[PDB]
Amino acid sequence: VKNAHAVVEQTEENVFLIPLKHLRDSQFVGTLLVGVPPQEIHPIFDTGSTNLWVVTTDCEEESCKKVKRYNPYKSKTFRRSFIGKNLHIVFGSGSISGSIGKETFVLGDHTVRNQTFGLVESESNNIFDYIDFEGIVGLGFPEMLSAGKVSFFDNLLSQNKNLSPQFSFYISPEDNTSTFLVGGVSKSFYEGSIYMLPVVKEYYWEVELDGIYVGEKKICCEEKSYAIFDTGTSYNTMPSAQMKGFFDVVPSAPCTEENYQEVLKNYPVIKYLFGDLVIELLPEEYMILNEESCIPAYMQIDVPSEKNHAYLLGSIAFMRHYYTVFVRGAGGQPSMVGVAKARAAAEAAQKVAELEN
Numbered sequence: 491v492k493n494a495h496a497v498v499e500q501t502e503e504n505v506f507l508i509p510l511k512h513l514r515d516s517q518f519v520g521t522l523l524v525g526v527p528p529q530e531i532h533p534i535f536d537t538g539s540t541n542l543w544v545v546t547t548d549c550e551e552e553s554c555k556k557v558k559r560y561n562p563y564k565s566k567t568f569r570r571s572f573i574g575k576n577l578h579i580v581f582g583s584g585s586i587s588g589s590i591g592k593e594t595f596v597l598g599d600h601t602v603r604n605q606t607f608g609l610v611e612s613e614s615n616n617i618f619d620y621i622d623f624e625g626i627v628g629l630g631f632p633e634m635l636s637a638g639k640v641s642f643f644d645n646l647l648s649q650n651k652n653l654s655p656q657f658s659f660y661i662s663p664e665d666n667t668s669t670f671l672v673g674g675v676s677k678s679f680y681e682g683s684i685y686m687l688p689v690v691k692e693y694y695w696e697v698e699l700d701g702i703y704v705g706e707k708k709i710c711c712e713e714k715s716y717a718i719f720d721t722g723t724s725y726n727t728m729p730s731a732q733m734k735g736f737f738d739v740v741p742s743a744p745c746t747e748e749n750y751q752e753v754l755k756n757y758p759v760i761k762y763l764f765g766d767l768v769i770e771l772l773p774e775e776y777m778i779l780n781e782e783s784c785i786p787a788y789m790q791i792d793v794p795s796e797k798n799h800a801y802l803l804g805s806i807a808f809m810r811h812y813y814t815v816f817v818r819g820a821g822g823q824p825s826m827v828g829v830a831k832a833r834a835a836a837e838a839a840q841k842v843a844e845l846e847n
């Protein structure tokens with residue numbers, strides 16, 4: 491059995507759109523209001539972590555002073571607890587450290603109170619030197635939380651009952667019209683039908699991956715593998731092993747204005763097999779031109795718990811071509827990721843809907 495969802499429509503204030511600016515350092519940043527009086531920070535919206543990070547004035551490092559740091563001692567709603575806790579996060583190309591606090595946030599005219607978040611205090615490992623980093627809005631599942639009782643998204647849903655437990659991304663950096671939608675989807679960002687993929691593990695937005703084909707060559711999968719939908723990354727990824735076998739069929743090379751145009755016509759078509767669904771990426775989709783060079787828009791990432799069996803899907807090499815919806819399950823019914831073709835057009839996204847049933 492498989493009961494379907496449906497695109498039932500909601501009123502305008504039940505799906506709100508957060509514009510995302512594609513910064514010249516590959517950051518997809520939006521606007522977020524912290525404290526009272528409001529202090530504006532521009533965080534990344536991430537479906538690969540649930541923690542709410544805010545760069546504060548308690549970080550006096552060189553990469554911290556260049557951005558709009560948040561000053562908790564100027565906020566009237568900030569209230570640290572008597573027995574303050576500390577926070578530690580280690581990722582691939584750096585690290586983030588700080589303390590925990592509770593604050594009241596406003597995300598696109600919606601207010602959220604008693605929101606536990608981490609105040610960034612240190613950033614030393616070297617990657618934050620290339621980025622004007624100001625915070626992270628966590629959109630992953632609550633099991634991925636390092637501290638706090640309720641996840642920001644869960645906490646926002648609890649205090650604004652008009653919002654349905656779902657959000658969606660439309661990536662289009664060229665036109666600068668990419669938008670983050672909370673509480674549903676907008677029919678003007680995609681065309682065709684929307685296909686759902688059940689979430690296997692409520693840690694990342696993770697679904698079973700049945701295979702990967704670059705043209706006709708099978709890169710994966712000989713052992714059960716999975717795909718993770720991460721809006722915090724620009725590149726698609728593969729584990730350490732399969733990454734080598736990939737760069738042998740699509741390698742980088744010098745390219746000119748008339749050399750890259752031909753690369754897009756002859757380069758293979760990558761196919762991602764999600765059970766019955768087959769999602770293809772064309773050469774003009776995953777190939778990028780940098781300093782007169784043709785780079786496969788892929789990088790190596792070994793997911794910790796999934797060894798060499800986890801493949802990530804990023805913003806520039808996937809979501810830019812496919813409108814993605816996130817539907818939070820509950821109890822028996824699972825959470826699911828919806829993929830459709832991106833309409834890649836302005837249209838007039840005044841009418842918005844949500845996935846029910």
Ligand SMILES: *[C@@H]1O[C@H](CO)[C@@H](O[C@@H]2O[C@H](CO)[C@@H](O[C@@H]3O[C@H](CO)[C@@H](O)[C@H](O)[C@@H]3O)[C@H](O)[C@H]2NC(C)=O)[C@H](O)[C@H]1NC(C)=O
Nearest residue numbers: 569570571592593594601602603604605606639645648649
């Ligand atoms: C977190 O925010 C909530 C609301 O967003 C704050 O509410 C606290 O919880 C309830 C709701 O007002 C209050 O507790 C009880 O209210 C009942 C009403 O029937 C009363 O009979 C009980 O004797 C008790 O007062 C509580 O007063 C309220 N505020 C405080 C300061 O306790 C909550 O305060 C926020 N954070 C924390 C840490 O409490």
Ligand SMILES: CC(C)[C@]1(C)CC(=O)N([C@H](c2ccccc2)c2cccc(C(=O)N[C@@H](C)c3ccccc3)c2)C(=N)N1
Nearest residue numbers: 534536538539581582583623626720722723724791793794
């Ligand atoms: C960015 C951090 C908040 C974190 C916690 C770091 C992090 O592990 N991932 C995924 C991820 C998810 C699951 C398993 C492994 C990796 C990922 C993947 C690949 C590369 C990057 C990367 O270097 N991202 C650049 C763009 C960037 C952005 C903003 C700040 C720093 C760095 C990130 C996040 N989504 N977020």
